[PDB]
Design a protein around this ligand. Structure first.
Ligand SMILES: O=C(O)CNC(=O)C(=O)O
Length: 363
């Protein structure tokens, strides 16, 4: 039976299939313990489920917030990306038209909105990302408020998924990490660890002509099933390959971020991404610019290291090496990389300044 990913038959079969529980890799942590200390101690290599919002500093509206309200705050005439799940093709319509669809009592289509970034709408002020995200995020920490280049617009997403909707396996753009909060309903995540062969398998799969006919989880040793219920929050680490299935109508909020715990994986994903040459819809805008700002901050931290005699932790120094490599790669090359370079940056001087500083540290 040659079925397509996201088809009614596929979903039907996917619902009945058995998966190792995410009990094996996903840590349950109360909102208050999810601190910079916790993250630094553990290294954010595994998904984290926070069952209850308390202590997260997450701000969301009450579950009494319906799809019709989203239409009201966002704007019924706003253009929105809509995935037809069963075709696995994307299209664009008015929010009001999707809403009309959502409230139909005989939907003949399976349609989701998963790309709706609402930072530029009246709905923005109803949602604030978890404090830990603000703490880890490169953009939040290191992208100046007065920058000439617009911040990456990936901070506040509203997701509206109907029953039996499916998003196929993917790595988030930029190897970015993610938080997902389920406001109403539930969402099932299928989580695959970014072990080196898994990433390599994922690239070959995603680049195969007939990937939409192949269930990726069939190719890996372990694909963990994680149900995220109403009121719960999931944090997905850099590089994890995941898909989702929505067992009932679901409303969720989400955001993407880069952080210093996963410099290596972030660059890896980015490289996979630039090879696949796909997407251009869910892409992490100005990933490279965020890296440039981080390079600057690093050079500024290495230097402060001389006034402190307090060397930099190994993972930052190794981050420096990775970013410097990427910097060298993007420059003297080539003609589109320049478009992501922040004002008043001297690419050549930063690179040499960082190489020396890394040199000094190792010595
Ligand atoms: O639909 C999905 O599960 C994938 N979601 C996204 O990448 C996002 O916008 O956070």
């Amino acid at each position: 039976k040659p079925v397509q990913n996201g088809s009614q038959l596929f979903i039907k079969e996917l619902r009945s299939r058995t998966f190792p529980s995410a009990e094996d890799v996903v840590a349950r942590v109360p909102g208050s313990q999810l601190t910079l200390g916790y993250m630094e101690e553990h290294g954010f290599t595994e998904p984290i489920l926070v069952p209850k919002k308390d202590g997260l500093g997450l701000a969301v509206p009450a579950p009494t917030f319906y799809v019709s309200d989203v239409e009201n705050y966002v704007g019924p005439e706003r253009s929105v990306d809509v995935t037809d799940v069963t075709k696995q093709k994307d299209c664009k319509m008015k929010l009001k038209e999707f809403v009309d669809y959502y409230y139909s009592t005989n939907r003949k289509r399976v349609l989701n909105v998963t790309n709706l970034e609402f930072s530029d709408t009246r709905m923005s002020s109803f949602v604030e990302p978890p404090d830990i995200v603000k703490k880890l995020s490169w953009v939040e920490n290191y992208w100046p408020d007065d920058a000439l280049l617009a911040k990456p617009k990936v901070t506040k997403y509203c997701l509206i998924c109907v029953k039996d909707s499916y998003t196929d396996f993917h790595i988030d753009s930029g190897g970015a990490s993610a938080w997902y909060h389920v406001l109403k309903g539930e969402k099932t995540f299928y989580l695959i660890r970014p072990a080196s062969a898994n990433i390599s398998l994922y690239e070959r799969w995603r680049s195969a002509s007939n990937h939409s006919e192949m269930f990726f989880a069939d190719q890996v040793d372990k694909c963990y099933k994680c149900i995220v219920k109403q009121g719960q929050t999931l944090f997905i680490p850099s590089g994890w390959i995941y898909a989702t299935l929505t067992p009932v109508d679901c409303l969720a909020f989400a955001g993407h971020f880069l952080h210093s715990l996963s410099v290596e994986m972030q660059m890896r994903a980015y490289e996979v991404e630039r090879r696949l040459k796909l997407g251009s819809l869910t892409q992490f805008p100005n990933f490279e610019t965020a890296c440039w700002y981080m390079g600057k901050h690093l050079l500024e931290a290495f230097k402060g290291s001389h006034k402190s005699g307090k060397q930099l932790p190994p993972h930052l120094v190794q981050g420096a090496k990775i970013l410097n490599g990427a910097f060298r790669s993007w420059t003297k090359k080539l003609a589109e990389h320049e478009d992501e370079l922040p004002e008043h940056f001297k690419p050549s001087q930063l690179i040499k300044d960082l190489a020396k500083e890394i040199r000094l540290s190792e010595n």
